[PDB]
Amino acid sequence: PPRKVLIISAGASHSVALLSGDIVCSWGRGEDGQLGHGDAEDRPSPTQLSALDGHQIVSVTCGADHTVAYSQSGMEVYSWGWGDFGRLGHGNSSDLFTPLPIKALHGIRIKQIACGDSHCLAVTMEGEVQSWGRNQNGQLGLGDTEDSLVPQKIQAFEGIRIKMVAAGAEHTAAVTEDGDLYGWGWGRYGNLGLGDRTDRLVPERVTSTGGEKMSMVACGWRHTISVSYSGALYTYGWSKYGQLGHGDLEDHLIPHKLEALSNSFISQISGGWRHTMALTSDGKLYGWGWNKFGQVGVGNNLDQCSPVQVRFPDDQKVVQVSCGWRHTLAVTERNNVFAWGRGTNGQLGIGESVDRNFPKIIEALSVDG
């Protein structure tokens, strides 16, 4: 059976993938250790992270300048990259250039991990949440403003099963299994969805949801995106670059339904530094927001304040998308992998390359060329 990409993830200037055979690979900026190869050099093409061979990794997730992965059979979570503020979770601030297990999470059944700039969170199979890293604006949800170098349980969610979490620069969001939406952390751009510009040190429930329950949530750097059980898309927070997608640059302090997509059912979402991607159930990918480096993928370098469909060869359907700070990655139905946007750190994975403003196939990871 031909080797394929199982999971992709984009960080600020790097890219990580999990391949069949439980193989982790990475490419892009390596200076802070985020690629995991033991050295500090950029890799312009996918490079196997051999130290994780045989660890049966089942998922990978990038933060801005660090990476996390976990194994079910090993009951282990691993982290590597820039170590400041405790974002790696090991009880110190050391950078790591090679993956190390987060001892505090050993033997815990992991459901999902989210990574922001300087903090991370893990959701357990029982719907509990642990968080770690920078906490200067309450983004850990622990009720104070002191950084945590190790994971701590978010006690505020006692009795509340969490389905998934999301993390931006310095804020955090979550949805419950029953459909409630929460926000906490740095809130100055309205990005918590609470109708104001004030931080929260513990999770606070978003009450203005258009009467709808939310099935998923994702964070860009200072904006937030959610999807309801009817497949409607909502955005809130920072609007400067059109990343909210409402056809203007208006601020939103509560979730605002994106009307242009109302006839579609959104199945996946991703928030970048200053851009946004949404995938429909029919496999159409839409992008919007900042496009200086071509990261929206629509064949130009003009910013886009309304969703525009990203096009692929033969109109192949998209199945996964992940936004970096200046680039975007996607996987299609044909098991092809594409990248676009900024390429100066090698993050596009296509060897030495100029920036790209529409999707470019990553030959190393694809069936086609």
Note the residues at the interface with Mg ion (CB under 5 A). 38-39, 97, 144
Backbone conformation region of residue 330, classed left if phi is above 0, alpha if psi is from -120 to 50, else beta: beta
- Among residues 4, 19, 22, 40, the one that binds a second copy under rule CB under 8 A: 40
Q: Can residue 42 be called a binding residue for a second copy (CB under 8 A)?
A: yes
Point out which span in 38-46, 117-125, 201-209, 280-288 binds a second copy (CB under 8 A).
Answer: 38-46
Q: Can residue 93 be called a binding residue for a second copy (CB under 8 A)?
A: yes
Residue with tokens 């170098």: 149
Helix, coil or strand: residue 268? strand
Q: How far is the CB of 353 from Mg ion (least distance, A)?
A: 10
Structure tokens that stand for 215 in this block: 């099935």
Q: How far is the CB of 191 from Mg ion (least distance, A)?
A: 13
Point out which span in 37-45, 51-59, 211-219, 263-271 binds a second copy (CB under 8 A).
Answer: 37-45
* Binding-site partner at residue 144 among Mg ion, a second copy, none, CB < 5 to 8 Å by type: Mg ion
Q: Is 144 exposed, middle or buried (0-12, 13-18, 19+ CB in 10 A)?
A: exposed
Please enumerate in sequence order all residues whose Cβ is within 8 A of that of 222, keeping only pairs 6 or more positions apart, or say none: 168, 169, 171, 189, 191, 237, 238
CA 26/CA 15 separation, integer angstroms: 6
Q: How far is the CB of 55 from a second copy (least distance, A)?
A: 26
Contact 144/135 with Cβ under 8 angstroms? yes
Among positions 211-270, residues that touch a second copy (CB under 8 A) are: 240
Minimal CA–CA distance to 244: which of 151, 307, 292, 176?
307
- Among residues 15, 26, 131, 137, the one that binds a second copy under rule CB under 8 A: 137
Q: How far is the CB of 354 from a second copy (least distance, A)?
A: 10
Please identify, using beta-carbon distances, which residue of 97 and 358 lies nearer to a second copy: 97
Please identify, using beta-carbon distances, which residue of 1 and 354 lies nearer to a second copy: 354
C-alpha dist (Å) from residue 357 to 283, 288, 296 = 20, 13, 7
Q: Can residue 147 be called a binding residue for a second copy (CB under 8 A)?
A: yes
Among positions 292-331, residues that touch a second copy (CB under 8 A) are: 292-293, 326
